[PDB]
Amino acid sequence: SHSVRVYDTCIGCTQCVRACPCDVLEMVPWDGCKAGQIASAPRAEDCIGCKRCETACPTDFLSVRVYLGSETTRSLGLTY
Amino acid sequence: TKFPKFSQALAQDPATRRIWYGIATAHDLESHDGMTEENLYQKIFASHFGHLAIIFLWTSGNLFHVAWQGNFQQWVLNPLKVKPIAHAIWDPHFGQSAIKAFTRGGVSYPVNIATSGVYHWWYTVGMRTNEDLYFGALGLLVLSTTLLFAGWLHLQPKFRPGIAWFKNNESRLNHHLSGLFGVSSLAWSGHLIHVAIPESRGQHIRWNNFTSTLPHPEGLTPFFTGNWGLYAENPDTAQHIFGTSEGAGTAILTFLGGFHPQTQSMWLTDIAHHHLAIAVVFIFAGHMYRTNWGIGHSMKEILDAHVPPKGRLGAGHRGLFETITDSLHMQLGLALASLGVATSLVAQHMYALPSYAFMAKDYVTQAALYTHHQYIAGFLMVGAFAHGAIFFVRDYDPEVNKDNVLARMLQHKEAIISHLSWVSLFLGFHTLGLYIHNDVCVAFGTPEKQILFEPVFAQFIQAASGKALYGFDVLLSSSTSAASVASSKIWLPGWMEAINSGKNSLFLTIGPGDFLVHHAIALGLHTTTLILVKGALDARGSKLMPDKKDFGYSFPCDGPGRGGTCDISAWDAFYLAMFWMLNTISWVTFYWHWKHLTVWGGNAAAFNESSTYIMGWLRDYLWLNSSPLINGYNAFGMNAQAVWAWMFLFGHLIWATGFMFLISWRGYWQELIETLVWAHERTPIANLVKWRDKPVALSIVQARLVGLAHFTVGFIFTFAPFVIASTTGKF
Amino acid sequence: VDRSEAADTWWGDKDYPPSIVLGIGKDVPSSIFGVTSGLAFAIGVYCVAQSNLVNILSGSTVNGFYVAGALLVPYSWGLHVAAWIQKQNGK
Amino acid sequence: MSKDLLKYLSTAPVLLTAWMSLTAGMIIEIQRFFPDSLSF
Amino acid sequence: TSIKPSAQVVWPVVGQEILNGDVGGGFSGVQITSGVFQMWRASGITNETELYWTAMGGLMMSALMVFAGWFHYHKAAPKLEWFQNVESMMNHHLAGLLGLGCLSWSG
Amino acid sequence: MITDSQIFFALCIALTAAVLAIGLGRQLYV
Amino acid sequence: DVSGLTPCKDSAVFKKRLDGSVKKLQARLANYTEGTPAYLALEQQIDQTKARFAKYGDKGLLCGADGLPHLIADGRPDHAGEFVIPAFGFLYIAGWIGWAGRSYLQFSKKTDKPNENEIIINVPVALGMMSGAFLWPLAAWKELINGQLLVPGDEVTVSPR
Amino acid sequence: TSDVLNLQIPTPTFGGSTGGWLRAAEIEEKYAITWTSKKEQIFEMPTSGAAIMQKGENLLYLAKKEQCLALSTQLRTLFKISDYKIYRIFPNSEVQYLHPKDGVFPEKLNEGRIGVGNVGYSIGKNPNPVNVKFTGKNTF
Lengths: 80, 731, 91, 40, 107, 30, 161, 140
Ligand code: CLA
Ligand code: CLA
Ligand SMILES: CC1=C(/C=C/C(C)=C/C=C/C(C)=C/C=C/C=C(C)/C=C/C=C(C)/C=C/C2=C(C)CCCC2(C)C)C(C)(C)CCC1
Ligand code: SF4
What we know:
This is part of a larger assembly, with eight protein chains of eight kinds. Chain B is mostly helical.
């Protein structure tokens, strides 16, 4: 499965989660950000790698970042 | 225990990409699961042993086939008329017409006419009968047997070499310089003096009597007395006939220069002296480095101290020893660059200075060899740059290379890439513009308006080397100069005649077509370097992707975000530069082949007139010389070039099929495979037969690889046929 | 030589190399280096001129002593760089 | 020829076409009046 | 049969004048391959004044069409109710455009 | 002219080399 | 003269090329009658061909064995007109172009809407910049000396090494 | 909520399609999505076609979590249905409740969620690959 990571440059604008089509990402409380929330990836096994999170991230460089890795039926997104 | 045992990720991969990626990363030993450096080095060593065994098996196979099915003995009697046979053809698909056509070369069975020059090589080296070739094949078979056993042995527990021994640079370089290059070249010079010069002079020296026969009448007494000029005294006469004693001398080591008049190849005495001297140099240089005896050099110390004053090159070469000796990719890149340059050098030197008897008049072999070695040189250069990129993205340590000569390359990579872009742009703009100017001017019935720049600088080099038709009268062309006088009793009396003789490929006459095509070659080299250098320097990161090193060397992309990130991985830089390697080598080989076809046919005023415009290349080279190939088989019958015509079309088809993988990308084929999976699963009868790996479309990098593969194989097949068949049909 | 057993010869922070770079000649003075370099240059250029410029080289005239003395010209360059290094290091 | 139409004529493509038109015409007239100049 | 049809002429500037090749009829020009000469012969055009005047008529129609395009967007633009009258559009395109066009050409 | 016995001897040495090649491939595979 | 080439005026192959082109034109002249526009155009064209060949002969161009002019680009002043003087002319013109572009960019960057000024060119000042770029070699040298040409690299975006 | 399904809810009226699961959802894993609608109305399936979601409860079978989430986004942004629940059904008939795992959609923060896959430094501070060479880890 692909590895999804979130760095502390997060501003808690909650757009990666909305761009997510597999419910891999979710906002959790955080002290660092002004908004008080940070994206997190508790369901990375369901990741497919379309990187809509990366597209929707508005940081100068991506707070949410996905590394492609070992492939699986879910990661390939095969209905069979 | 599934196929990619070395990669558990692919082992759990359920789709058909498991097999593809397992085969693809079979040899990527650095990134295998549970790999250590010591095991990596030992596995590389054993694989090297197996590879050497493969090389010697290939050589033994060529030798045995020429011995068994080739007309070597008949070819020896009449080298200039009998066509050398590679091997017999065994094909149940051949018809009677093809059987009669391929029955050639003075034998009763179908055969393939050798275009590798192995016949000329072995004849020059001293082989005269099939028995000698067979014994050479037997000995090479035994050598490969021993190399395979050595490879097996050096993986055993008690025989597994250690990492310190592998990283012992000084001993390895000392031994390679002194013995692998030096003593091996000395052995070749000894072989020449003992077996090749006597055979050229009509003496049968073999294992049974080489111990008794003296190579020189005086023996080693001149060598020990120091009167080594007695080995040059009495050279071969200009009336010498190769392989006979008439006109034969006694000298074993000479520096006559030029060419042997009958064979139009350099003197074997000259070649033996070359290998003897060059070995002296290399055996000396192999005592440079310190190995267990104090005296010598320390490469780390040398690199550390070589830092210019006031920090001109930053910290100098500090850390380069550590990076080179730790990273195998940097060593591989240096080796590939050096070997590609050497392959280009041999390609450029064999045609200008033939060394094998009667090769110059064998026009097909010369073109085949030049094209072969130029293509391999291009591949080696692209590989050198690709492994430099892999080193940058995988093995480069900025902490070690703090303010280093290597780190400053990354520091001003933007300047380097921008200036390579500038020079590539200038060269292409101006070369294409001048070619189009010439095209339009000749098209409009006024060739006088052509802008034709004389290659005055190359002509000046030719004059300084000895050419006299330009009238520059500089250096060796001017008999009076110090350069011409100091060497006037060693090599110039032969070299002057050789270079000014118009029957040779040594320093061909050049003109405006040569000017323009050379600038085109410069464009090709510069743009290939631009793509490759950019890939290497941006492999670590870019403004569009500063964290590229985290993703690695070969990944598909970064997604459609940030405007799209296609072909960003710096593997795709290699895949792009491969097209330019093919382009520039194709330009080089077209230039070589057309100029040499014209020179051999005796109308150089076809190249000098038509090569200034591009329609001249399209008509007087491609279209004109494509007739004997495409007429290999037609509606009225077939000739012996039908195989070349079929392979010509074959390379065209593969080149075309590559465009599919290069243009059409994965989403279309993935959805189509969904449809095919539906159909197979839903049809009756067949749905009992069910796959194990889920069939998926090819990955992005996989398909880029496949498309480039189809392109390259295609390139080589098409030009091989066109270069081997048109030459045969025109001469 | 290994990574560990290697002298600290980097000198990018300083104006002249350490004398250790000269190896076996890390203690021979700058005076000896310079005098030997000058004699080597003179002798080697004499040998080269006598071999190829004053005379014409050939199979019957190549002289081993002149050939060997020619190799003192690059040795002269090395010796003069060494003389400068030792003069700057204070020896 | 309001300020808006002057602005439109000042837009990049119109200006490119106008200037390259004048340049090509200049080159062609130099060719007509000084033809076949493969030298200076 | 012998005359090569040609309806284009280059100017002598940079040597392109050779492109005015021999096309028969005491005329130098670029041979055409569009069949317009045969089209005009079928139509019955036998003079150059007819070609000139139909060209002028075509320019007048082009001006009228530019005017119509400006008028039907800037002065009097139809409505979606007008546009969606597909039945009347088909009736007028069959009988009115194609039918009367064919009738007029037959005449 | 290469003889039948010569070809057979070369083939035998080739077979020995083949066995060694299988062995080396095994040992590289482990 | 040089490179084995001979002057085009004393070149038998050059004279034959001229004669052959003339014979080709006269051969195609047979189709047209005297006085027609095509006839007069061909007469003008053949006059132009002869004038071109005479001009090449007089200019001192060197003709090779192929009988076509070969330009000697080695820096000798005998053949300066082949490359050196055209080279200087182009270098001046290209410098003019680049200086006009750069100076207009420097003006536009200070405008309130540089992005819109990039598309919509301020033609009244663009003409001024184009005219003033005639003295670019002195202007560029002045900017070099004052240090306002090459921005310090410590101020240019650079990718992570 | 809970790892269970009724497995008897009336399904949307659909005329069948070729885009459904094929000999793999029954052997490896199927997916289900269940929602409630105020009116019986027409919607577009993730598989090609048009179906009629029934009044009240509706249950649909699919082969991909991506398909279920796409249908969910359609339901939210067209019909304003925001009570959907998504399940994964194994061949051994275990049912795992996946998407609204905390009972609320992931885009709204909850107090009990803990961070998974969070890095305490900026993106441009990862170790180089040479540092992790011949180690099982990775540069993130
Ligand atoms: C739309 C197509 C079309 C048109 C426009 C015409 C036109 C004509 N056809 Mg017909 N015709 C057609 C299709 C067409 N045809 C088809 C398809 C066929 C095959 C079935 C025929 C078969 C046919 C035949 C067999 C004959 C005609 C004839 C005629 C003439 C009839 C006069 C008339 O009825 O006045 C109608 C009058 C009015 C409606 C009253 C108004 C009168 C106005 C004001 C008079 C204007 C006069 C003019 C502007 C000035 C002329 C001055 C003069 C000194 C030059 C006229 C030239 C006859 C003819 O003359 O043949 C050469 C004839 O014998 N046609
Ligand atoms: C404003 C004008 C301008 C200036 C001063 C420069 C300057 C430079 N460019 Mg160029 N460049 C320009 C426009 C300009 N560029 C444009 C519009 C493009 C897009 C096509 C490029 C694309 C480009 C590339 C891809 C590269 C350069 C490079 C370079 C450098 C080398 C010079 C060269 O070879 O030019 C090459 C010139 C061209 C490729 C075409 C130029 C286009 C026209 C002819 C000029 C524009 C004039 C403009 C309309 C003036 C408006 C002013 C007016 C309103 C008053 C240099 C820093 C090279 C580099 O980095 O070298 C270090 C390089 O690789 N440039
Ligand atoms: C990226 C990278 C890489 C790669 C690289 C490459 C691939 C390169 C190549 C390169 C090359 C490929 C180069 C070449 C060079 C050459 C030269 C430099 C030459 C020289 C020459 C000379 C000096 C000569 C002289 C002479 C003589 C001696 C005689 C005659 C005359 C004359 C003058 C000619 C590496 C791995 C490193 C790593 C890092 C990164
Ligand atoms: S920076 Fe990216 S991960 Fe962070 S809140 Fe914004 S969209 Fe979400």
